[PDB]
Design a protein around this nucleic acid. Structure first.
Lengths: 141, 124, 116
DNA sequence: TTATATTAATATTATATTTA
DNA sequence: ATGAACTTCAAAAAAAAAAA
DNA sequence: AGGAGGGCGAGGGCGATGCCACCTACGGCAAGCTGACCCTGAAGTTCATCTGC
RNA sequence: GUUGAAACAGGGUCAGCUUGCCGUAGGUGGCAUCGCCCUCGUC
């Protein structure tokens, strides 16, 4: 929650007065946050929308690379730190989704009290039992 | 509200400065610029700067203390604090920056709570 | 750890506004945005302004009273937190207003000080 | 808008290593 | 013939401190 | 040769370790947009459809 | 086994876009460590 300053008022303010024109404002930043999105690419709705395997590799590329390209003063630096996809053999689910998401457990590093980077997190995947018929394809991690 | 065994160098230095000013303000209570008023700004941030000079300056306050046993009272807790201070840190860490003010006011409370120092000394 | 630092800010700004009656940049207007949300960034430096404000209090006894209550406030504080959760910046604001209307109470600080 | 005068303050410890 | 589809119906509705 | 190699007691006394003020000034803490689309109705009839004739 | 059943909040939508905390300000001005004290008394 950084209080930035602007050295130019925007409008003819109630206070755009004599000396300086200033519109301080706020530039909130996360000093670091390892956000864990869970995602579900369901075959059943891939049937009604025609979501192709091509349209899916485009989405994989998008997730891996979409912060390298969507930058701003507001968000500064965001990175895709890992995309662990669980491709199930059936258009049903081989396993419950959350059984596969707890499978990718991300914990702050051993003794970091506050996290500053991905280096202060540990993303341990569990590819030991999903071989039931499933595929964990690790795209970013 | 005083962790006498905190070991947080900022907190122990705050405690140390609190007792240092307690001695200065008991040495001559009528004092224009106590070491809070003249030294605290860096004692909280640059403990090496002052805390050396604060203890050039300390035995003379202990002398100026009217009650000669009160000098032992306060010097004893200076030592109790300084057991936890293996070194005056060059620059107090920011956590330690705040914990110095914490220590100043925690130990200042401990000194201005009526019997605390005279009691706690007598268990040593 | 947010409410007691709100109280701490209230006493700190009261001491400043008691030291300098007419201030253009009270430690509210200057340090609040980061004392509310980021106490180590500020309260480590508000409280270096503090001995000077207490020194400048024309009634040195009032300085003693205000320093006593900031000792009491800060006795509930074991460490200024690195960052105040959204839960506590509300406390800080509530703590600030609580303590500042305690200070601007008729005899509240004089009384509370006198019962110690 | 208000409010705006001083807390606490009396001694720790204290009896000999080394000597072809 | 029953039940969805459709066609009419009708035409908004609006605030908010003092202090004697 | 056999010497004796100090014995004694003092090693601070006194007071002062601050005085003075200042610890801020100034102003800005927003601008601008949006705050939702879409539907879903009663009530009635039609109209397509079904059953029975 | 004759008595309110059936019933979605849905489908989905970056809060963005960005903005110096600043310009700057002596810690000063100054203050005696002092006043003084047989190493003695003697073998």
């Amino acid at each position: 929650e950084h209080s930035i300053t602007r050295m130019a008022v925007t409008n003819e303010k109630d206070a755009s007065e004599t000396g300086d024109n200033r519109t301080m404002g706020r530039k909130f930043t996360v000093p670091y946050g390892l956000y864990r999105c869970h995602g579900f690419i369901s075959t059943h709705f891939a049937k009604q929308t025609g979501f192709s395997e091509n349209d899916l590799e485009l989405f994989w590329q998008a997730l891996v690379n979409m912060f390298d390209h969507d930058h701003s003063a507001a968000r500064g630096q965001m990175n895709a730190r890992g995309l662990y996809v669980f491709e199930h053999s059936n258009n049903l689910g081989d396993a419950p989704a959350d059984s596969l998401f707890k499978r990718i457990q991300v914990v702050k590093k051993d003794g970091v009290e506050v996290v500053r980077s991905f280096d202060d997190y540990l993303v341990s995947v569990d590819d030991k039992n999903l071989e039931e018929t499933k595929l964990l394809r690790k795209l970013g991690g | 509200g005083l962790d006498r065994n905190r070991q947080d160098i900022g907190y122990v230095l705050g405690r140390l400065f609190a007792v240092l000013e307690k001695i200065q303000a008991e040495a001559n209570p009528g004092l224009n610029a106590t070491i809070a008023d003249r030294y605290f700004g860096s004692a909280s941030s640059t403990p090496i700067a002052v805390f050396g000079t604060l203890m050039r300056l300390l035995p003379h306050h202990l002398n100026k203390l009217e009650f000669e046993g009160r000098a032992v009272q306060l010097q004893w807790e200076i030592r109790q604090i300084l057991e936890h201070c293996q070194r005056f840190p060059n620059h107090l860490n920011l956590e330690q920056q705040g914990l110095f003010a914490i220590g100043y006011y925690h130990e200042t409370q401990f000194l201005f709570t009526k019997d605390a120092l005279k009691n706690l000394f007598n268990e040593a | 750890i947010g409410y007691v630092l709100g109280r701490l800010f209230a006493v700190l700004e009261k001491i400043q506004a008691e030291a300098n009656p007419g201030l253009n940049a009270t430690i509210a207007d200057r340090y609040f945005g980061s004392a509310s949300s980021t106490p180590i960034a500020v309260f480590g430096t508000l409280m270096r302004l503090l001995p000077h404000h207490l020194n400048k209090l024309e009634f040195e006894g009032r300085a003693v009273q205000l320093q006593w209550e900031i000792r009491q406030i800060l006795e509930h504080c074991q460490r200024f937190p690195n960052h105040l959760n959204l839960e506590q910046q509300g406390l800080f604001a509530i703590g600030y207003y609580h303590e500042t209307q305690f200070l601007f109470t008729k005899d509240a600080l004089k009384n509370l000080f006198n019962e110690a």
